[PDB]
Design a protein around this ligand. Sequence first.
Ligand SMILES: [Fe+3]
Ligand SMILES: [Fe+3]
Ligand SMILES: [Fe+3]
Ligand SMILES: [Fe+3]
Ligand SMILES: [Fe+3]
Ligand SMILES: [Fe+3]
Ligand SMILES: [Fe+3]
Ligand SMILES: [Fe+3]
Ligand SMILES: [Fe+3]
Ligand SMILES: [Fe+3]
Ligand SMILES: [Fe+3]
Ligand SMILES: [Fe+3]
Ligand SMILES: [Fe+3]
Ligand SMILES: [Fe+3]
Ligand SMILES: [Fe+3]
Ligand SMILES: [Fe+3]
Ligand SMILES: [Fe+3]
Ligand SMILES: [Fe+3]
Ligand SMILES: [Fe+3]
Ligand SMILES: [Fe+3]
Ligand SMILES: [Fe+3]
Ligand SMILES: [Fe+3]
Ligand SMILES: [Fe+3]
Ligand SMILES: [Fe+3]
Ligand SMILES: [Fe+3]
Ligand SMILES: [Fe+3]
Ligand SMILES: [Fe+3]
Ligand SMILES: [Fe+3]
Ligand SMILES: [Fe+3]
Ligand SMILES: [Fe+3]
Ligand SMILES: [Fe+3]
Ligand SMILES: [Fe+3]
Ligand SMILES: [Fe+3]
Ligand SMILES: [Fe+3]
Ligand SMILES: [Fe+3]
Ligand SMILES: [Fe+3]
Ligand SMILES: [Fe+3]
Ligand SMILES: [Fe+3]
Ligand SMILES: [Fe+3]
Ligand SMILES: [Fe+3]
Ligand SMILES: [Fe+3]
Ligand SMILES: [Fe+3]
Ligand SMILES: [Fe+3]
Ligand SMILES: [Fe+3]
Ligand SMILES: [Fe+3]
Ligand SMILES: [Fe+3]
Ligand SMILES: [Fe+3]
Ligand SMILES: [Fe+3]
Lengths: 162, 162, 162, 162, 162, 162, 162
Amino acid sequence: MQKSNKINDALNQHYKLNVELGLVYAHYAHVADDEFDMPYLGKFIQHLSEDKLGVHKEYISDYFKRNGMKLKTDVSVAVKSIPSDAKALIQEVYARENEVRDHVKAIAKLALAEDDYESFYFIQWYVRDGLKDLTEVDDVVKLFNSSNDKLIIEETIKEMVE
Amino acid sequence: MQKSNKINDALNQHYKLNVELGLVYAHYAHVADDEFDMPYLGKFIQHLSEDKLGVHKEYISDYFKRNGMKLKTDVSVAVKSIPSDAKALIQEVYARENEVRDHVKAIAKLALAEDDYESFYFIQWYVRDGLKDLTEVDDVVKLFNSSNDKLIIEETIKEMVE
Amino acid sequence: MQKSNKINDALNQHYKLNVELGLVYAHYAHVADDEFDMPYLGKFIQHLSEDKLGVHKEYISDYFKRNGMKLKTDVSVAVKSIPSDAKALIQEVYARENEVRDHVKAIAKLALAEDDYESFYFIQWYVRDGLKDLTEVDDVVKLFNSSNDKLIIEETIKEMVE
Amino acid sequence: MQKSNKINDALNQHYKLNVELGLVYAHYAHVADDEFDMPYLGKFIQHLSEDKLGVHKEYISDYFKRNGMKLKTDVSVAVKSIPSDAKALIQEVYARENEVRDHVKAIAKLALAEDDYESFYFIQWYVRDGLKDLTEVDDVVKLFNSSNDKLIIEETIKEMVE
Amino acid sequence: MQKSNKINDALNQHYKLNVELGLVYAHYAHVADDEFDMPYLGKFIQHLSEDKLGVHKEYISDYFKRNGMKLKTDVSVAVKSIPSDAKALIQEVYARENEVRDHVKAIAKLALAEDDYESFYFIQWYVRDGLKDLTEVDDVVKLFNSSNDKLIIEETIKEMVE
Amino acid sequence: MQKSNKINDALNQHYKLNVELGLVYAHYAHVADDEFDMPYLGKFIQHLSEDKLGVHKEYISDYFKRNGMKLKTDVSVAVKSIPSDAKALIQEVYARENEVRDHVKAIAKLALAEDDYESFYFIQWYVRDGLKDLTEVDDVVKLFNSSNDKLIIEETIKEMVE
Amino acid sequence: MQKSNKINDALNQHYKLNVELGLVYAHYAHVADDEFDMPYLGKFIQHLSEDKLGVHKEYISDYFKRNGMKLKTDVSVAVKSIPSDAKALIQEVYARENEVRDHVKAIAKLALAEDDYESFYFIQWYVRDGLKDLTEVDDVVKLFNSSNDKLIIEETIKEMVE
Ligand SMILES: [Fe+3]
Ligand SMILES: [Fe+3]
Ligand SMILES: [Fe+3]
Ligand SMILES: [Fe+3]
Ligand SMILES: [Fe+3]
Ligand SMILES: [Fe+3]
Ligand SMILES: [Fe+3]
Ligand SMILES: [Fe+3]
Ligand SMILES: [Fe+3]
Ligand SMILES: [Fe+3]
Ligand SMILES: [Fe+3]
Ligand SMILES: [Fe+3]
Ligand SMILES: [Fe+3]
Ligand SMILES: [Fe+3]
Ligand SMILES: [Fe+3]
Ligand SMILES: [Fe+3]
Ligand SMILES: [Fe+3]
Ligand SMILES: [Fe+3]
Ligand SMILES: [Fe+3]
Ligand SMILES: [Fe+3]
Ligand SMILES: [Fe+3]
Ligand SMILES: [Fe+3]
Ligand SMILES: [Fe+3]
Ligand SMILES: [Fe+3]
Ligand SMILES: [Fe+3]
Ligand SMILES: [Fe+3]
Ligand SMILES: [Fe+3]
Ligand SMILES: [Fe+3]
Ligand SMILES: [Fe+3]
Ligand SMILES: [Fe+3]
Ligand SMILES: [Fe+3]
Ligand SMILES: [Fe+3]
Ligand SMILES: [Fe+3]
Ligand SMILES: [Fe+3]
Ligand SMILES: [Fe+3]
Ligand SMILES: [Fe+3]
Ligand SMILES: [Fe+3]
Ligand SMILES: [Fe+3]
Ligand SMILES: [Fe+3]
Ligand SMILES: [Fe+3]
Ligand SMILES: [Fe+3]
Ligand SMILES: [Fe+3]
Ligand SMILES: [Fe+3]
Ligand SMILES: [Fe+3]
Ligand SMILES: [Fe+3]
Ligand SMILES: [Fe+3]
Ligand SMILES: [Fe+3]
Ligand SMILES: [Fe+3]
């Protein structure tokens, strides 16, 4: 029956987070290619950008249509400083994906507290994807600690963003 | 040789405009489906959203990589009121696409003033797409003035967003 | 280990509800076609009837075989008045599907209370299908509020029950 | 021309009989598998259940649409005791199918008495299927009198419900 | 964020249980074939052995890599007495699979207590497989109570471990 | 004719050695991936684990069925310290495979001493595989002495564990 | 109508520039392979040589045939010193491609000044190719600043001049 307002707000914020994250990553992808001369790192980060700005926000929008929750569009993001090198750039992406896992955990917890079993279900996809996206990112961070050669690292990323 | 700062700013603003427009349309697509019961109108507007948030912003980002212009990410958009009915919604989309045509005209004009023939070229795509997107939108507005039946109109949009 | 009697009763009632619902819809499908001259509405409602009388009851019966819960067959249903028009008919179907969502929510809640994680799992399918069936039904109700032409509406349903 | 009320009532009862029979068999199929460890016997009886709850009731509903007879849905069935073993279970199914043959004979006889040659025709399908379903059932009963080995019997049923 | 130590220990024990179970079943498969002259029973039990020693332990190992839980390898198992006949052998396997269902239930319960929604998800696979493996095993136990002929039973198992 | 007890014991120990080795390697594969960031090294070592826990133990179990030797399952293995780096890890694996070659040599020697020409034959497979597995391992050890770049080494292992 | 002499001279010089550039690059390709042991760098530079000596000069020659401009062949080029290493070699190629962009910009500017809209069109291809060729070259220069290993760099160029 009736929609939970708490869940509605929590999913609107997550909508907001995926929009703004995806806009940050689109900038980070540009810089990976341009300043840092790592176009495959940039193609890995652009695919993560399109992920956040696509299905991560689409599923919420579609879910709201089915249960009567209200969509809210309030976006504010400015990319004001860039990490100093490619390593720090991908470590930054990592840190935001770890925060994704913490936010979706709060939403699952709330859904059980509300007895919103439809929302707990809806969020199970995000529960899993939080770890998948974090793992894929972690697989790139590891590269910068396994070789000091930008072109070696780039050649390895190629086989990941194929 | 040297990048024109005026063109750099003008293309950063157009980047900003396409991001924010595409975020507005993604909301407008939701409402077309949800409140107004017109899922094909919503699929037409979601495709326009993905257009603005995809190649419209990607081409600028890629162009900047080739000539040395600096990418700027500063986004601010809140969807605070929605048009009252489907007709007004698509008329609103129309009005923004007409403003797109005026903004790209300013950029072409500036590129000639700067003797930036690479930028005049780059913008020729946007020159044409301004009219194409406006025409496609206009083809939907016309529908609301040609029949008073939501389901008739919807069935016609289907053959456009195929 | 040991089967929860509470869950056994709750799933027997849901078995009962799907049988009786599916028998009501089979009658409602007939009337949609016969009295109301809407054979596609009738084919939409007959497919929902076969859904409830098929996998909705089969999954419970099969689940009981695996865990030792006892099947109970006690059916009582009489279709004693019919809604006055096609709109009211599909609105009636809607109202019962909304009650399905409330009943499956009670079963998920109980399964957690009982620490019956096998039953919480089994019910996740019903958790999702409650919203899917309700959405599909809602997509038909919307039609009667979007056009006053029976044949227009019928032509739209055709593309849903394909 | 005008519909015979006697035939209308006789076909409504047969509708009722097929619904309730099919609900009994769905329970009997469960028990064949669960208690009696004979899943192929259970698959034979589930197919007979779906037969009664499908085309046996659908043909009447569809026939009524063509001639103006009124559909009646009044169902009452409770499965309150189960036969003691698989043999007795299939003998029970047999006895109900023999009663099907007697009921359809009454309807053919009445249709001639009423000079309802459309209804005599419609019922010819049921005239034949009464003997076919009874024969298929009889082919399973014979198995329990031809071998004392549950797994031998099961392996034979497999080639019937293929 | 931070890994739950309780969950880490509970999943290490389950790792241990699947290793040792799979080593017991590999022995039980040998005996089913050798002493008891039932090679298909032995092929059913060898497939269950490879299941426990494969994906049942691999998924935990892979999950630990993604979240930072520590893998522990401490194995101790000796097969010191064998059941007296094939029936008792498969009943023994049954009893261990029923204990699997109880252990995974404890892990799901703990994951909710810890608000480890990633671990509750990870375990949902084990929640379902506990019942699937138990059912498949139960389907073999039933055979020894449905016929007194070893070769009849063997021929039936063949169609299960195909 | 009669089974040699000495050979029976020697093959039971080799059974034990392959089980426990394969359990150690499954842990070593995890660590290669997790701690050392070398997933292809980990995939090489996991394939060696599955080799030891599969056909290396299966062939003995199957051989015992044919000649009447008794299978013994007594397993004890705990992984209590891990080598400090990837190089030392693969050197450790090497050292155990060299001990495999010494153990199978003892079994061939004993089989001739016993005039067990069936067992000498059975062991010829292990005679050859001792050198093959050792060579494949040696091909990985050589990598750590041929380049100081983890990602270079990883890319080479990829073409071996294809 | 009448051909612009200014445009005729400007396009004859560009003809001259592409001939002489392409002859320089053919020498630079030889040296990349021979002295510097980088055959893929040499294959990248030979393809750029054939580009300048092919379509870059052919399009002008063909354009002159259509509008009545006079072809002039006056070539003077001697390769008298070579850059000291592969890096400096590709940086040299870069610097000449940047001068190409400046020369074609002068021709576009002149064509507008002359109201030679056919020549402005003809040159739009060169406007774009100036940036494309420069970008491809820049993608090779970046390699020498991303790794100190000639064979690593060579392996990367391979995937560009495929
Ligand atoms: Fe609120
Ligand atoms: Fe992806
Ligand atoms: Fe909405
Ligand atoms: Fe960098
Ligand atoms: Fe609660
Ligand atoms: Fe994702
Ligand atoms: Fe390489
Ligand atoms: Fe400026
Ligand atoms: Fe388009
Ligand atoms: Fe840039
Ligand atoms: Fe509207
Ligand atoms: Fe000018
Ligand atoms: Fe567009
Ligand atoms: Fe139409
Ligand atoms: Fe009770
Ligand atoms: Fe369906
Ligand atoms: Fe049962
Ligand atoms: Fe009506
Ligand atoms: Fe609890
Ligand atoms: Fe359903
Ligand atoms: Fe139409
Ligand atoms: Fe009457
Ligand atoms: Fe049939
Ligand atoms: Fe009727
Ligand atoms: Fe029985
Ligand atoms: Fe008569
Ligand atoms: Fe039948
Ligand atoms: Fe047979
Ligand atoms: Fe601890
Ligand atoms: Fe399996
Ligand atoms: Fe680990
Ligand atoms: Fe036995
Ligand atoms: Fe809690
Ligand atoms: Fe399993
Ligand atoms: Fe047989
Ligand atoms: Fe001995
Ligand atoms: Fe191998
Ligand atoms: Fe044996
Ligand atoms: Fe290491
Ligand atoms: Fe001898
Ligand atoms: Fe081997
Ligand atoms: Fe390579
Ligand atoms: Fe002149
Ligand atoms: Fe080219
Ligand atoms: Fe000429
Ligand atoms: Fe060099
Ligand atoms: Fe002019
Ligand atoms: Fe070119």
